[PDB]
Structure 1
Amino acid sequence: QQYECVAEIGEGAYGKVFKARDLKNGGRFVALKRVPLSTIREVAVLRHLETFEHPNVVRLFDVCTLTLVFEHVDQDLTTYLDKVPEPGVPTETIKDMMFQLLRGLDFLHSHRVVHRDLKPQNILVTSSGQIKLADFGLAVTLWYRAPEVLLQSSYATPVDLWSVGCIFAEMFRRKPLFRGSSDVDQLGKILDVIGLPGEEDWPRDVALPRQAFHSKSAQPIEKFVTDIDELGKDLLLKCLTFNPAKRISAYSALSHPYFQ
């Protein structure tokens, strides 16, 4: 066999993911995920995106015929944040890591692919300090979920920029912003901070009415994220817009004055 399983990374959600040895290619570490026609189209898309070899998405090495073979990265964002020396992440490091993130996201959005579960645990940091995206394109924590996903209203690309706002905040605080035990609790936490949207912004034909949430004003963001720039504040707000339509795009965000 070309691969020897040595460890189980974890997840176990869609399937069991193993860290192995690529015996045929110099014993480099790889990540394996052993897993109808809707799945066959899911992998065709991954193989297709590998052709452009974007630097800010994890590399897909092979598809054995069913196991998927990715490069292994030893580290994720949470572990980087765990082990970052106090006072924490230099603001210039935040800017670049973010820039790498939106570049990966724009690449995916451009080819009409949504991550749908963008969290710090499937954001990889290579030894070279490069950002790589993982665990997307194949069908527990709600802390990074867009309001539309929670409300079961829309599941479009704006969802992934909501998650980016959440992560952007977490790079200063080094603690998650919205920690909900459930979808409604999650929704509660969000509206405590960003405030109650207008009725025109609340999607129609949805279980949860705007009237299940009370006294929600609009807390200034500096209170939750300190040592944040004016330009960073501007960008964070356009990402954490309640209405997916009024929310900024990855392409549009890559041009924001914050990055200059």
Structure 2
Amino acid sequence: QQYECVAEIGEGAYGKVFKARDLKNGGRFVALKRVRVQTGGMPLSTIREVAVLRHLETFEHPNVVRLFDVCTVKLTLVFEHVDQDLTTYLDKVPEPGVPTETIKDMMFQLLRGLDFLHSHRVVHRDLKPQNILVTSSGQIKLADFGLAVTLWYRAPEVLLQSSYATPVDLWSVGCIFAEMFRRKPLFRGSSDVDQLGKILDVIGLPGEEDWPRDVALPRQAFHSKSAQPIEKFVTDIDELGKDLLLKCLTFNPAKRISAYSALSHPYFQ
């Protein structure tokens, strides 16, 4: 065999990720993701999703994890190995937290890799610090995308089950943006209705025209009254970071800022 697994990195709905030894490339560390596929025979939606992943590899974007090899048997993906994710970085950073300019750089690399995905019509749909990898040199690399439970980073339209477009990932970016300063999740709910309730306690109840129609939860189901200043939960944030954070934490996904427009925000000057 060409690879040799040495440890398990994690398992879940994505599959099972292993830390492996690239026996034919000098023994470098790699990440093997095995995923079973119900053959009949392989589903066309899975074959098409792999072609998009190899096409996205041709660009070799620095803010997405590298795809080295693809093997078949039921489906093994060989990615470059990153030593830690975002949670491990936030847990190990000394006091009083992440440097202010380090947050700006990591948020910029996050938006670059996300804009690269949205430019090719790819929605991450599950952006969270657990799948945001931090290179030993400090680079941000996105992982676990393109292949089809914490609700703390779900967009309001996902909790309401209405729309699932690219603004879904920008809401998660806002939740991660606040967690940069807080080093603890901003909206930490225990259910679908609980997560949406703690969201509306901060950003306030949106207008009746902003609430999606033909959803189970109506606007009257929540009495969250008014909004609160964001600097109460996210201390040490500046004016430019506050304006960018609020444009990501917009209820209406149509009024939410895009990853492309977020790259040109005055916060990155």
Q: TM-score, normalised by structure 2?
A: 0.95
- Measure the CA separation in 2 of the matches of 1:127 and 1:74: 7
What secondary structure is seen at the aligned counterpart in 2 of 1:225? coil
Contact residue 17 and residue 32 of structure 2 kept, 8 A: yes
CA offsets, 1:145-198, max 9 Å, x none?
A: 000011110000000000000000000011100011111100001001000001
Contact residue 200 and residue 224 of structure 2 kept, 8 A: no
What secondary structure is seen at the aligned counterpart in 2 of 1:24? coil
Contact residue 197 and residue 224 of structure 2 kept, 8 A: no
Distance change >3 Å, CA 41–CA 234, structure 1 → 2: same
CA offsets, 1:98-128, max 9 Å, x none?
A: 0100000000000000000000010001011
Q: TM-score, normalised by structure 1?
A: 0.98
Structure 1 unaligned blocks of 5 or more: none
CA offsets, 1:26-68, max 9 Å, x none?
A: 11111111x9110111110000000000000000000012200
- Measure the CA separation in 2 of the matches of 1:201 and 1:227: 30
- Measure the CA separation in 2 of the matches of 1:233 and 1:192: 17
- Show the counterpart of 1:250: 259
- Pair 1:216-2:225 in alignment: yes
CA RMSD of superposed structures (Å): 1.0
- Measure the CA separation in 1 of the matches of 2:22 and 2:161: 41
Distance change >3 Å, CA 58–CA 196, structure 1 → 2: same
How far 1:10 moved relative to its partner?
Answer: 1.2
Q: Judge which range, 13-22 or 80-89, deviates more.
A: 13-22
- Measure the CA separation in 2 of the matches of 1:108 and 1:218: 32
- Measure the CA separation in 2 of the matches of 1:136 and 1:229: 31
Runs of 4+ in 1 over 3 A off after TM superposition: none
Q: What number of residue pairs does the alignment pair up?
A: 259
How far 1:227 moved relative to its partner?
Answer: 0.6
Contact residue 115 and residue 260 of structure 2 kept, 8 A: yes
What secondary structure is seen at the aligned counterpart in 2 of 1:200? coil
- Measure the CA separation in 2 of the matches of 1:165 and 1:140: 19
How far 1:14 moved relative to its partner?
Answer: 3.0
How far 1:216 moved relative to its partner?
Answer: 2.7
- Measure the CA separation in 2 of the matches of 1:206 and 1:128: 45
- Pair 1:127-2:127 in alignment: no
- Show the counterpart of 1:45: 52
CA offsets, 1:71-94, max 9 Å, x none?
A: 110111100000000011110000
